[PDB]
Write a protein that binds this ligand. Sequence first.
Ligand SMILES: *S(=O)(=O)c1cccc(S(=O)(=O)Nc2cc(C3=CCCC3)ccc2C(=O)O)c1
Ligand SMILES: *S(=O)(=O)c1cccc(S(=O)(=O)Nc2cc(C3=CCCC3)ccc2C(=O)O)c1
Ligand SMILES: [Cl-]
Lengths: 237, 249
Amino acid sequence: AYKLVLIRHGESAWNLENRFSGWYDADLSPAGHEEAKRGGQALRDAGYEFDICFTSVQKRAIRTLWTVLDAIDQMWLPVVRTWRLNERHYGGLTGLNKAETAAKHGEAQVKIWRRSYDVPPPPMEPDHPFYSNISKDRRYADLTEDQLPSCESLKDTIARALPFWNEEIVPQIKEGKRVLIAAHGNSLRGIVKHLEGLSEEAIMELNLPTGIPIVYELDKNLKPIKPMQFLGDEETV
Amino acid sequence: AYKLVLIRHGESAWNLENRFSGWYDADLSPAGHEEAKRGGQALRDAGYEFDICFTSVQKRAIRTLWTVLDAIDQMWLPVVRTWRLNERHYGGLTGLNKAETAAKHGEAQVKIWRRSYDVPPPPMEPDHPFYSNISKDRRYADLTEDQLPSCESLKDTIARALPFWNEEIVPQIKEGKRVLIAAHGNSLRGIVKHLEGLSEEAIMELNLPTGIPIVYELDKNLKPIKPMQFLGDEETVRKAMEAVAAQGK
Ligand SMILES: *S(=O)(=O)c1cccc(S(=O)(=O)Nc2cc(C3=CCCC3)ccc2C(=O)O)c1
Ligand SMILES: *S(=O)(=O)c1cccc(S(=O)(=O)Nc2cc(C3=CCCC3)ccc2C(=O)O)c1
Ligand SMILES: [Cl-]
């Protein structure tokens, strides 16, 4: 069985402020860095070896990957970065905390966005405080005008993440390369939804743990042979 | 027409033991990490931007690159690693200090090796304590038997670094991508000798500072407009270049 490992990054600087990050490039907090260290040590203790790594273009995921590669002494591995593994774009909610979001948009709309698979948050418009910071960041300069989001539902995030899974990661797995993916909750949710054939309701009920190596065993058709498993001592899990 | 930046990593844990590292994967010391941070901050303060980065498969260079990318807020850049940018392979000298090398191999051979462009150190044989650690590391599993060195003169190092420059780096430069290369003294010497047309004698004497960004302005044919220039406070650079010139002497 092919072996695939996923890791979701840990706590970020804006988690501490209860602020929606999305495509804002928030760094890990010291605690999120420590989580990545512990996940890397769990991989080292289990003897895991990789051949290629994939991550987003967001530093909280990239730094998680760097920390893991340092812990497992595989800093020399090829690394591929792609915006398609980015966190969901939270649109006009970017940079707001919970209270500001409730005050600006109302409890009704908040519950809609919270529980909906396919209703996006408001768009990030040119007067938004983070519009230039994100939409004019040169790391997205090669995206076409229809690819750069102003906002994303979970459905949207999964829709632009899965082409990268299908067209780049799958061929690598099929040639026997041992893949590590360090990314974000919602983009990894896309991968999990696809691997396991989950419903919209099922994937919205799925919260992946942070900082914990998530291990899949895949058959010749890249179908999981059993549920995802977690690495680390039992209490940390 | 084009701008190119090189950075040589700083002190490693084995430098503090006065031991030959070569392809041994020694990590940075605190001082080596600090030099990377200062080079990154120099690039940040001058507003430098890159589009692609090249480094070796050795962590002292990779960690220097990581520290620079952190400092300049460009951790999202594509990074390409290659053994062809590795440090010179010191063969059987790997792991030895200067006294042990002199005792084992003689002052006569030491003098030859240190002054010579094309006489390699002794081969690292299977009984060498670091043979399995280096020659059987899976990161080199895809190298042909002819590509995997047992030892390298400076000429050998340059001969395997320049194919990567010509095949992988030059096309990125010609596309207009702003390239950063974070590597090692001897592989960077290959790039410098090629760009500036220096003699063997001059490239073996050339002072290559650690942790100081090295900047080239190149014309459309990739010829330097001026020789390498150094980024950073003038007095810090001046003192650093006096230091390396003194170490050469
Ligand atoms: S996202 O990165 O997965 C995310 C980040 C923070 C919170 C959530 S959520 O609570 O699961 N969903 C959500 C909540 C809210 C508000 C709650 C209290 C005031 C605003 C707004 C939007 C969302 C959402 O679109 O997911 C998810
Ligand atoms: S290498 O990393 O560039 C290097 C490191 C230390 C010293 C040199 S060298 O003096 O220029 N050349 C050299 C010296 C020696 C010894 C000196 C005293 C005892 C052994 C051995 C080999 C070399 C060499 O291969 O160039 C270079
Ligand atoms: Cl990297």
